[PDB]
Amino acid sequence: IITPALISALKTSFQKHFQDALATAPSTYLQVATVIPSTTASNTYGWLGQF
Amino acid sequence: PKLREWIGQRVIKDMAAQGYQITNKLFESTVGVKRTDIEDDNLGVYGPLM
């Protein structure tokens, strides 16, 4: 009645659920924020002080 | 210029010996990197900047 297959199916269903939810999440920070990816130990980014 | 009517005469273009002297100019800009974030591998910056 309960097997790892059922747990994996529920995991995939939840994955799809909240992936769809997040993909449609409202965006408001991008209006007044700048997105900057980082890879490791990122603490300094010297584009500031330049106009 | 406009189509002119014959009166037994000829009319050549009017305006001549004049100019405007636009005097084109030049513009530039520059940006920096600070040489620090390269070590940190924070190369995400400078994409949206450019």
PDB file of N, CA and C in Angstrom:
ATOM      1  N   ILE A   1       0.840  -1.190   0.000  1.00  0.00           N
ATOM      2  CA  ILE A   1       0.000   0.000   0.000  1.00  0.00           C
ATOM      3  C   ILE A   1       0.879   1.245   0.000  1.00  0.00           C
ATOM      4  N   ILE A   2       1.960   1.199   0.775  1.00  0.00           N
ATOM      5  CA  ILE A   2       2.933   2.284   0.852  1.00  0.00           C
ATOM      6  C   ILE A   2       4.265   1.743   0.353  1.00  0.00           C
ATOM      7  N   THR A   3       4.803   2.365  -0.686  1.00  0.00           N
ATOM      8  CA  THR A   3       6.063   1.960  -1.287  1.00  0.00           C
ATOM      9  C   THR A   3       6.851   3.204  -1.662  1.00  0.00           C
ATOM     10  N   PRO A   4       8.170   3.079  -1.831  1.00  0.00           N
ATOM     11  CA  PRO A   4       8.956   4.248  -2.257  1.00  0.00           C
ATOM     12  C   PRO A   4       8.453   4.865  -3.549  1.00  0.00           C
ATOM     13  N   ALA A   5       7.812   4.078  -4.417  1.00  0.00           N
ATOM     14  CA  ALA A   5       7.285   4.629  -5.661  1.00  0.00           C
ATOM     15  C   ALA A   5       6.225   5.689  -5.390  1.00  0.00           C
ATOM     16  N   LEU A   6       5.329   5.432  -4.432  1.00  0.00           N
ATOM     17  CA  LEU A   6       4.314   6.423  -4.089  1.00  0.00           C
ATOM     18  C   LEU A   6       4.951   7.692  -3.539  1.00  0.00           C
ATOM     19  N   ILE A   7       5.976   7.543  -2.697  1.00  0.00           N
ATOM     20  CA  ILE A   7       6.653   8.711  -2.141  1.00  0.00           C
ATOM     21  C   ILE A   7       7.309   9.520  -3.252  1.00  0.00           C
ATOM     22  N   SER A   8       7.958   8.842  -4.199  1.00  0.00           N
ATOM     23  CA  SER A   8       8.583   9.547  -5.314  1.00  0.00           C
ATOM     24  C   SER A   8       7.540  10.247  -6.177  1.00  0.00           C
ATOM     25  N   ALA A   9       6.392   9.601  -6.398  1.00  0.00           N
ATOM     26  CA  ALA A   9       5.332  10.232  -7.177  1.00  0.00           C
ATOM     27  C   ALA A   9       4.820  11.487  -6.484  1.00  0.00           C
ATOM     28  N   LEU A  10       4.617  11.420  -5.167  1.00  0.00           N
ATOM     29  CA  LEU A  10       4.192  12.604  -4.426  1.00  0.00           C
ATOM     30  C   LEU A  10       5.256  13.692  -4.481  1.00  0.00           C
ATOM     31  N   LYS A  11       6.529  13.303  -4.390  1.00  0.00           N
ATOM     32  CA  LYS A  11       7.616  14.270  -4.483  1.00  0.00           C
ATOM     33  C   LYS A  11       7.594  14.983  -5.828  1.00  0.00           C
ATOM     34  N   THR A  12       7.422  14.225  -6.912  1.00  0.00           N
ATOM     35  CA  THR A  12       7.372  14.832  -8.239  1.00  0.00           C
ATOM     36  C   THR A  12       6.151  15.731  -8.391  1.00  0.00           C
ATOM     37  N   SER A  13       5.003  15.302  -7.861  1.00  0.00           N
ATOM     38  CA  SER A  13       3.804  16.128  -7.944  1.00  0.00           C
ATOM     39  C   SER A  13       3.998  17.449  -7.212  1.00  0.00           C
ATOM     40  N   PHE A  14       4.562  17.401  -6.003  1.00  0.00           N
ATOM     41  CA  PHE A  14       4.828  18.628  -5.261  1.00  0.00           C
ATOM     42  C   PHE A  14       5.847  19.495  -5.990  1.00  0.00           C
ATOM     43  N   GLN A  15       6.874  18.865  -6.565  1.00  0.00           N
ATOM     44  CA  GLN A  15       7.867  19.599  -7.337  1.00  0.00           C
ATOM     45  C   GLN A  15       7.197  20.386  -8.450  1.00  0.00           C
ATOM     46  N   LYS A  16       6.358  19.715  -9.242  1.00  0.00           N
ATOM     47  CA  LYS A  16       5.646  20.406 -10.310  1.00  0.00           C
ATOM     48  C   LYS A  16       4.764  21.514  -9.750  1.00  0.00           C
ATOM     49  N   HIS A  17       4.055  21.231  -8.653  1.00  0.00           N
ATOM     50  CA  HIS A  17       3.153  22.213  -8.064  1.00  0.00           C
ATOM     51  C   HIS A  17       3.886  23.510  -7.747  1.00  0.00           C
ATOM     52  N   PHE A  18       4.882  23.443  -6.860  1.00  0.00           N
ATOM     53  CA  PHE A  18       5.516  24.691  -6.451  1.00  0.00           C
ATOM     54  C   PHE A  18       6.457  25.248  -7.513  1.00  0.00           C
ATOM     55  N   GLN A  19       6.931  24.437  -8.463  1.00  0.00           N
ATOM     56  CA  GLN A  19       7.673  25.002  -9.584  1.00  0.00           C
ATOM     57  C   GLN A  19       6.769  25.884 -10.430  1.00  0.00           C
ATOM     58  N   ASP A  20       5.560  25.402 -10.727  1.00  0.00           N
ATOM     59  CA  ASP A  20       4.595  26.227 -11.441  1.00  0.00           C
ATOM     60  C   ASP A  20       4.239  27.465 -10.631  1.00  0.00           C
ATOM     61  N   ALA A  21       4.073  27.304  -9.316  1.00  0.00           N
ATOM     62  CA  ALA A  21       3.738  28.446  -8.471  1.00  0.00           C
ATOM     63  C   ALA A  21       4.835  29.506  -8.512  1.00  0.00           C
ATOM     64  N   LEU A  22       6.095  29.085  -8.385  1.00  0.00           N
ATOM     65  CA  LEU A  22       7.202  30.035  -8.370  1.00  0.00           C
ATOM     66  C   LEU A  22       7.395  30.684  -9.734  1.00  0.00           C
ATOM     67  N   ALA A  23       7.241  29.912 -10.812  1.00  0.00           N
ATOM     68  CA  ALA A  23       7.407  30.476 -12.147  1.00  0.00           C
ATOM     69  C   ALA A  23       6.441  31.627 -12.390  1.00  0.00           C
ATOM     70  N   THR A  24       5.271  31.593 -11.755  1.00  0.00           N
ATOM     71  CA  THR A  24       4.267  32.639 -11.892  1.00  0.00           C
ATOM     72  C   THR A  24       4.281  33.620 -10.726  1.00  0.00           C
ATOM     73  N   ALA A  25       5.309  33.579  -9.885  1.00  0.00           N
ATOM     74  CA  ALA A  25       5.357  34.470  -8.736  1.00  0.00           C
ATOM     75  C   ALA A  25       5.456  35.923  -9.200  1.00  0.00           C
ATOM     76  N   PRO A  26       4.718  36.843  -8.575  1.00  0.00           N
ATOM     77  CA  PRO A  26       4.842  38.256  -8.957  1.00  0.00           C
ATOM     78  C   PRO A  26       6.253  38.773  -8.727  1.00  0.00           C
ATOM     79  N   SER A  27       6.687  39.664  -9.614  1.00  0.00           N
ATOM     80  CA  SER A  27       8.012  40.266  -9.551  1.00  0.00           C
ATOM     81  C   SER A  27       7.867  41.751  -9.251  1.00  0.00           C
ATOM     82  N   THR A  28       8.495  42.200  -8.165  1.00  0.00           N
ATOM     83  CA  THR A  28       8.501  43.610  -7.795  1.00  0.00           C
ATOM     84  C   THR A  28       9.878  44.146  -7.437  1.00  0.00           C
ATOM     85  N   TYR A  29      10.827  43.295  -7.041  1.00  0.00           N
ATOM     86  CA  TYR A  29      12.158  43.784  -6.699  1.00  0.00           C
ATOM     87  C   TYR A  29      12.926  44.238  -7.933  1.00  0.00           C
ATOM     88  N   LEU A  30      12.711  43.583  -9.078  1.00  0.00           N
ATOM     89  CA  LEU A  30      13.464  43.923 -10.278  1.00  0.00           C
ATOM     90  C   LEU A  30      13.263  45.374 -10.693  1.00  0.00           C
ATOM     91  N   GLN A  31      12.157  45.998 -10.287  1.00  0.00           N
ATOM     92  CA  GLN A  31      11.939  47.401 -10.626  1.00  0.00           C
ATOM     93  C   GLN A  31      13.000  48.293  -9.994  1.00  0.00           C
ATOM     94  N   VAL A  32      13.364  48.021  -8.741  1.00  0.00           N
ATOM     95  CA  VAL A  32      14.283  48.880  -8.002  1.00  0.00           C
ATOM     96  C   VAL A  32      15.444  48.069  -7.440  1.00  0.00           C
ATOM     97  N   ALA A  33      15.778  46.956  -8.090  1.00  0.00           N
ATOM     98  CA  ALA A  33      16.890  46.120  -7.663  1.00  0.00           C
ATOM     99  C   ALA A  33      17.632  45.595  -8.883  1.00  0.00           C
ATOM    100  N   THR A  34      18.906  45.270  -8.683  1.00  0.00           N
ATOM    101  CA  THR A  34      19.765  44.734  -9.730  1.00  0.00           C
ATOM    102  C   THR A  34      20.165  43.311  -9.369  1.00  0.00           C
ATOM    103  N   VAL A  35      19.979  42.389 -10.309  1.00  0.00           N
ATOM    104  CA  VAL A  35      20.299  40.982 -10.096  1.00  0.00           C
ATOM    105  C   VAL A  35      21.765  40.757 -10.439  1.00  0.00           C
ATOM    106  N   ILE A  36      22.487  40.103  -9.534  1.00  0.00           N
ATOM    107  CA  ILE A  36      23.912  39.836  -9.713  1.00  0.00           C
ATOM    108  C   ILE A  36      24.219  38.413  -9.259  1.00  0.00           C
ATOM    109  N   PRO A  37      24.448  37.473 -10.173  1.00  0.00           N
ATOM    110  CA  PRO A  37      24.831  36.121  -9.751  1.00  0.00           C
ATOM    111  C   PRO A  37      26.253  36.085  -9.213  1.00  0.00           C
ATOM    112  N   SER A  38      26.509  35.080  -8.379  1.00  0.00           N
ATOM    113  CA  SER A  38      27.832  34.871  -7.806  1.00  0.00           C
ATOM    114  C   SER A  38      28.096  33.375  -7.716  1.00  0.00           C
ATOM    115  N   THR A  39      29.379  33.021  -7.681  1.00  0.00           N
ATOM    116  CA  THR A  39      29.807  31.627  -7.712  1.00  0.00           C
ATOM    117  C   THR A  39      30.378  31.134  -6.393  1.00  0.00           C
ATOM    118  N   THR A  40      31.249  31.904  -5.745  1.00  0.00           N
ATOM    119  CA  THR A  40      31.844  31.457  -4.493  1.00  0.00           C
ATOM    120  C   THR A  40      32.546  32.624  -3.819  1.00  0.00           C
ATOM    121  N   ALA A  41      32.324  32.761  -2.512  1.00  0.00           N
ATOM    122  CA  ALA A  41      33.018  33.747  -1.685  1.00  0.00           C
ATOM    123  C   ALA A  41      32.986  35.129  -2.334  1.00  0.00           C
ATOM    124  N   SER A  42      31.795  35.530  -2.771  1.00  0.00           N
ATOM    125  CA  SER A  42      31.598  36.826  -3.413  1.00  0.00           C
ATOM    126  C   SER A  42      31.250  37.853  -2.343  1.00  0.00           C
ATOM    127  N   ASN A  43      32.167  38.791  -2.104  1.00  0.00           N
ATOM    128  CA  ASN A  43      31.949  39.864  -1.143  1.00  0.00           C
ATOM    129  C   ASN A  43      32.263  41.249  -1.685  1.00  0.00           C
ATOM    130  N   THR A  44      33.037  41.365  -2.759  1.00  0.00           N
ATOM    131  CA  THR A  44      33.391  42.650  -3.344  1.00  0.00           C
ATOM    132  C   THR A  44      33.005  42.667  -4.815  1.00  0.00           C
ATOM    133  N   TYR A  45      32.431  43.789  -5.249  1.00  0.00           N
ATOM    134  CA  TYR A  45      32.062  43.990  -6.651  1.00  0.00           C
ATOM    135  C   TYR A  45      32.219  45.480  -6.933  1.00  0.00           C
ATOM    136  N   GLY A  46      33.303  45.835  -7.617  1.00  0.00           N
ATOM    137  CA  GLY A  46      33.686  47.224  -7.750  1.00  0.00           C
ATOM    138  C   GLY A  46      33.181  47.930  -8.989  1.00  0.00           C
ATOM    139  N   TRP A  47      31.863  47.993  -9.155  1.00  0.00           N
ATOM    140  CA  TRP A  47      31.248  48.918 -10.095  1.00  0.00           C
ATOM    141  C   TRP A  47      30.764  50.181  -9.399  1.00  0.00           C
ATOM    142  N   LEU A  48      30.910  50.252  -8.079  1.00  0.00           N
ATOM    143  CA  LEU A  48      30.464  51.385  -7.286  1.00  0.00           C
ATOM    144  C   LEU A  48      31.555  52.445  -7.232  1.00  0.00           C
ATOM    145  N   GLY A  49      31.131  53.698  -7.100  1.00  0.00           N
ATOM    146  CA  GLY A  49      32.036  54.819  -7.207  1.00  0.00           C
ATOM    147  C   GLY A  49      32.347  55.231  -8.626  1.00  0.00           C
ATOM    148  N   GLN A  50      31.804  54.527  -9.616  1.00  0.00           N
ATOM    149  CA  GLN A  50      31.980  54.848 -11.026  1.00  0.00           C
ATOM    150  C   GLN A  50      30.647  55.352 -11.562  1.00  0.00           C
ATOM    151  N   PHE A  51      30.657  56.545 -12.157  1.00  0.00           N
ATOM    152  CA  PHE A  51      29.448  57.203 -12.654  1.00  0.00           C
ATOM    153  C   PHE A  51      29.613  57.482 -14.143  1.00  0.00           C
TER     154      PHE A  51
ATOM    155  N   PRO B   1      11.812  74.725 -53.874  1.00  0.00           N
ATOM    156  CA  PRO B   1      11.621  74.660 -55.328  1.00  0.00           C
ATOM    157  C   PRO B   1      10.157  74.445 -55.675  1.00  0.00           C
ATOM    158  N   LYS B   2       9.702  75.134 -56.720  1.00  0.00           N
ATOM    159  CA  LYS B   2       8.313  75.063 -57.140  1.00  0.00           C
ATOM    160  C   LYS B   2       8.226  75.253 -58.647  1.00  0.00           C
ATOM    161  N   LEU B   3       7.189  74.667 -59.240  1.00  0.00           N
ATOM    162  CA  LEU B   3       6.990  74.793 -60.676  1.00  0.00           C
ATOM    163  C   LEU B   3       6.638  76.234 -61.024  1.00  0.00           C
ATOM    164  N   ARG B   4       7.411  76.814 -61.936  1.00  0.00           N
ATOM    165  CA  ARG B   4       7.338  78.229 -62.261  1.00  0.00           C
ATOM    166  C   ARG B   4       6.671  78.429 -63.616  1.00  0.00           C
ATOM    167  N   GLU B   5       6.035  79.587 -63.773  1.00  0.00           N
ATOM    168  CA  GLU B   5       5.222  79.890 -64.943  1.00  0.00           C
ATOM    169  C   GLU B   5       6.036  80.675 -65.961  1.00  0.00           C
ATOM    170  N   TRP B   6       5.849  80.357 -67.241  1.00  0.00           N
ATOM    171  CA  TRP B   6       6.597  81.029 -68.296  1.00  0.00           C
ATOM    172  C   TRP B   6       6.092  82.452 -68.476  1.00  0.00           C
ATOM    173  N   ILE B   7       7.025  83.396 -68.531  1.00  0.00           N
ATOM    174  CA  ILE B   7       6.750  84.765 -68.938  1.00  0.00           C
ATOM    175  C   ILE B   7       7.719  85.220 -70.021  1.00  0.00           C
ATOM    176  N   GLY B   8       8.251  84.286 -70.806  1.00  0.00           N
ATOM    177  CA  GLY B   8       9.296  84.596 -71.760  1.00  0.00           C
ATOM    178  C   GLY B   8      10.632  84.786 -71.073  1.00  0.00           C
ATOM    179  N   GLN B   9      10.859  84.042 -69.993  1.00  0.00           N
ATOM    180  CA  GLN B   9      12.052  84.208 -69.176  1.00  0.00           C
ATOM    181  C   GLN B   9      12.438  82.857 -68.584  1.00  0.00           C
ATOM    182  N   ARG B  10      13.557  82.841 -67.860  1.00  0.00           N
ATOM    183  CA  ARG B  10      14.041  81.652 -67.175  1.00  0.00           C
ATOM    184  C   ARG B  10      14.457  82.031 -65.762  1.00  0.00           C
ATOM    185  N   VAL B  11      14.180  81.146 -64.806  1.00  0.00           N
ATOM    186  CA  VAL B  11      14.499  81.371 -63.400  1.00  0.00           C
ATOM    187  C   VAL B  11      15.332  80.196 -62.905  1.00  0.00           C
ATOM    188  N   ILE B  12      16.562  80.481 -62.487  1.00  0.00           N
ATOM    189  CA  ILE B  12      17.438  79.476 -61.904  1.00  0.00           C
ATOM    190  C   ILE B  12      17.244  79.477 -60.390  1.00  0.00           C
ATOM    191  N   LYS B  13      17.683  78.394 -59.744  1.00  0.00           N
ATOM    192  CA  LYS B  13      17.580  78.279 -58.294  1.00  0.00           C
ATOM    193  C   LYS B  13      18.022  79.572 -57.619  1.00  0.00           C
ATOM    194  N   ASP B  14      17.370  79.888 -56.501  1.00  0.00           N
ATOM    195  CA  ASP B  14      17.578  81.157 -55.814  1.00  0.00           C
ATOM    196  C   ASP B  14      18.715  81.093 -54.799  1.00  0.00           C
ATOM    197  N   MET B  15      18.600  80.216 -53.805  1.00  0.00           N
ATOM    198  CA  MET B  15      19.525  80.218 -52.681  1.00  0.00           C
ATOM    199  C   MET B  15      20.907  79.746 -53.112  1.00  0.00           C
ATOM    200  N   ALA B  16      21.934  80.358 -52.530  1.00  0.00           N
ATOM    201  CA  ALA B  16      23.319  80.031 -52.842  1.00  0.00           C
ATOM    202  C   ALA B  16      24.219  80.833 -51.912  1.00  0.00           C
ATOM    203  N   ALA B  17      25.489  80.440 -51.867  1.00  0.00           N
ATOM    204  CA  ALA B  17      26.508  81.132 -51.082  1.00  0.00           C
ATOM    205  C   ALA B  17      26.054  81.312 -49.633  1.00  0.00           C
ATOM    206  N   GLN B  18      25.831  80.181 -48.969  1.00  0.00           N
ATOM    207  CA  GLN B  18      25.402  80.187 -47.577  1.00  0.00           C
ATOM    208  C   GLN B  18      25.697  78.818 -46.982  1.00  0.00           C
ATOM    209  N   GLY B  19      25.700  78.760 -45.653  1.00  0.00           N
ATOM    210  CA  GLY B  19      25.955  77.515 -44.956  1.00  0.00           C
ATOM    211  C   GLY B  19      25.316  77.531 -43.585  1.00  0.00           C
ATOM    212  N   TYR B  20      25.535  76.443 -42.850  1.00  0.00           N
ATOM    213  CA  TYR B  20      25.002  76.293 -41.502  1.00  0.00           C
ATOM    214  C   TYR B  20      26.070  76.034 -40.451  1.00  0.00           C
ATOM    215  N   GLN B  21      27.191  75.409 -40.815  1.00  0.00           N
ATOM    216  CA  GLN B  21      28.292  75.151 -39.888  1.00  0.00           C
ATOM    217  C   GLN B  21      27.813  74.309 -38.700  1.00  0.00           C
ATOM    218  N   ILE B  22      27.437  73.069 -39.023  1.00  0.00           N
ATOM    219  CA  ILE B  22      26.955  72.150 -37.995  1.00  0.00           C
ATOM    220  C   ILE B  22      28.030  71.917 -36.940  1.00  0.00           C
ATOM    221  N   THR B  23      29.284  71.750 -37.366  1.00  0.00           N
ATOM    222  CA  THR B  23      30.414  71.564 -36.456  1.00  0.00           C
ATOM    223  C   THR B  23      30.191  70.342 -35.557  1.00  0.00           C
ATOM    224  N   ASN B  24      30.183  69.178 -36.206  1.00  0.00           N
ATOM    225  CA  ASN B  24      29.968  67.924 -35.497  1.00  0.00           C
ATOM    226  C   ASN B  24      30.916  67.807 -34.309  1.00  0.00           C
ATOM    227  N   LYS B  25      30.486  67.052 -33.300  1.00  0.00           N
ATOM    228  CA  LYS B  25      31.216  66.893 -32.048  1.00  0.00           C
ATOM    229  C   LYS B  25      31.416  65.406 -31.770  1.00  0.00           C
ATOM    230  N   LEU B  26      31.968  65.102 -30.596  1.00  0.00           N
ATOM    231  CA  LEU B  26      32.270  63.734 -30.201  1.00  0.00           C
ATOM    232  C   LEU B  26      31.851  63.504 -28.756  1.00  0.00           C
ATOM    233  N   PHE B  27      31.543  62.246 -28.441  1.00  0.00           N
ATOM    234  CA  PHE B  27      31.102  61.855 -27.111  1.00  0.00           C
ATOM    235  C   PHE B  27      31.777  60.547 -26.727  1.00  0.00           C
ATOM    236  N   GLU B  28      31.865  60.298 -25.423  1.00  0.00           N
ATOM    237  CA  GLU B  28      32.497  59.077 -24.938  1.00  0.00           C
ATOM    238  C   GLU B  28      32.024  58.793 -23.519  1.00  0.00           C
ATOM    239  N   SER B  29      32.279  57.562 -23.076  1.00  0.00           N
ATOM    240  CA  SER B  29      32.016  57.146 -21.707  1.00  0.00           C
ATOM    241  C   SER B  29      32.997  56.042 -21.345  1.00  0.00           C
ATOM    242  N   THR B  30      33.165  55.818 -20.043  1.00  0.00           N
ATOM    243  CA  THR B  30      34.070  54.779 -19.569  1.00  0.00           C
ATOM    244  C   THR B  30      33.580  54.242 -18.232  1.00  0.00           C
ATOM    245  N   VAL B  31      33.893  52.969 -17.978  1.00  0.00           N
ATOM    246  CA  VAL B  31      33.523  52.286 -16.747  1.00  0.00           C
ATOM    247  C   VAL B  31      34.728  51.498 -16.248  1.00  0.00           C
ATOM    248  N   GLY B  32      34.646  51.063 -14.990  1.00  0.00           N
ATOM    249  CA  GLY B  32      35.719  50.342 -14.344  1.00  0.00           C
ATOM    250  C   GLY B  32      35.272  48.994 -13.800  1.00  0.00           C
ATOM    251  N   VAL B  33      36.253  48.257 -13.277  1.00  0.00           N
ATOM    252  CA  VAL B  33      36.006  46.935 -12.708  1.00  0.00           C
ATOM    253  C   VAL B  33      36.547  46.774 -11.295  1.00  0.00           C
ATOM    254  N   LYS B  34      37.544  47.552 -10.878  1.00  0.00           N
ATOM    255  CA  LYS B  34      38.176  47.556  -9.563  1.00  0.00           C
ATOM    256  C   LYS B  34      39.141  46.383  -9.374  1.00  0.00           C
ATOM    257  N   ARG B  35      39.211  45.429 -10.302  1.00  0.00           N
ATOM    258  CA  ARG B  35      40.186  44.342 -10.309  1.00  0.00           C
ATOM    259  C   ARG B  35      40.025  43.379  -9.134  1.00  0.00           C
ATOM    260  N   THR B  36      39.029  43.569  -8.268  1.00  0.00           N
ATOM    261  CA  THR B  36      38.901  42.743  -7.071  1.00  0.00           C
ATOM    262  C   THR B  36      37.987  41.541  -7.288  1.00  0.00           C
ATOM    263  N   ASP B  37      36.785  41.767  -7.821  1.00  0.00           N
ATOM    264  CA  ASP B  37      35.802  40.695  -7.938  1.00  0.00           C
ATOM    265  C   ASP B  37      36.225  39.603  -8.912  1.00  0.00           C
ATOM    266  N   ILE B  38      37.250  39.841  -9.735  1.00  0.00           N
ATOM    267  CA  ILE B  38      37.731  38.797 -10.635  1.00  0.00           C
ATOM    268  C   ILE B  38      38.229  37.600  -9.835  1.00  0.00           C
ATOM    269  N   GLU B  39      38.981  37.856  -8.762  1.00  0.00           N
ATOM    270  CA  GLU B  39      39.451  36.764  -7.917  1.00  0.00           C
ATOM    271  C   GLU B  39      38.285  36.023  -7.275  1.00  0.00           C
ATOM    272  N   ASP B  40      37.274  36.759  -6.810  1.00  0.00           N
ATOM    273  CA  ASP B  40      36.108  36.137  -6.194  1.00  0.00           C
ATOM    274  C   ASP B  40      35.222  35.416  -7.200  1.00  0.00           C
ATOM    275  N   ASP B  41      35.469  35.582  -8.499  1.00  0.00           N
ATOM    276  CA  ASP B  41      34.671  34.929  -9.535  1.00  0.00           C
ATOM    277  C   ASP B  41      33.231  35.435  -9.535  1.00  0.00           C
ATOM    278  N   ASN B  42      33.028  36.677  -9.108  1.00  0.00           N
ATOM    279  CA  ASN B  42      31.709  37.308  -9.148  1.00  0.00           C
ATOM    280  C   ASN B  42      31.463  37.971 -10.499  1.00  0.00           C
ATOM    281  N   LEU B  43      31.613  37.189 -11.569  1.00  0.00           N
ATOM    282  CA  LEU B  43      31.474  37.708 -12.924  1.00  0.00           C
ATOM    283  C   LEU B  43      30.024  37.947 -13.319  1.00  0.00           C
ATOM    284  N   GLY B  44      29.067  37.682 -12.429  1.00  0.00           N
ATOM    285  CA  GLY B  44      27.684  38.001 -12.739  1.00  0.00           C
ATOM    286  C   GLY B  44      27.493  39.476 -13.033  1.00  0.00           C
ATOM    287  N   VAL B  45      28.219  40.331 -12.317  1.00  0.00           N
ATOM    288  CA  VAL B  45      28.226  41.762 -12.593  1.00  0.00           C
ATOM    289  C   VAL B  45      28.843  41.960 -13.970  1.00  0.00           C
ATOM    290  N   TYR B  46      28.628  43.131 -14.562  1.00  0.00           N
ATOM    291  CA  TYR B  46      29.203  43.566 -15.831  1.00  0.00           C
ATOM    292  C   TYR B  46      28.478  42.978 -17.035  1.00  0.00           C
ATOM    293  N   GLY B  47      27.456  42.149 -16.850  1.00  0.00           N
ATOM    294  CA  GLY B  47      26.590  41.786 -17.945  1.00  0.00           C
ATOM    295  C   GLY B  47      25.536  42.853 -18.170  1.00  0.00           C
ATOM    296  N   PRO B  48      24.667  43.044 -17.174  1.00  0.00           N
ATOM    297  CA  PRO B  48      23.715  44.160 -17.255  1.00  0.00           C
ATOM    298  C   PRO B  48      24.393  45.513 -17.317  1.00  0.00           C
ATOM    299  N   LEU B  49      25.599  45.652 -16.758  1.00  0.00           N
ATOM    300  CA  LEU B  49      26.315  46.921 -16.862  1.00  0.00           C
ATOM    301  C   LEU B  49      26.600  47.268 -18.319  1.00  0.00           C
ATOM    302  N   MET B  50      27.209  46.338 -19.059  1.00  0.00           N
ATOM    303  CA  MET B  50      27.472  46.584 -20.473  1.00  0.00           C
ATOM    304  C   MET B  50      26.175  46.710 -21.260  1.00  0.00           C
TER     305      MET B  50
END
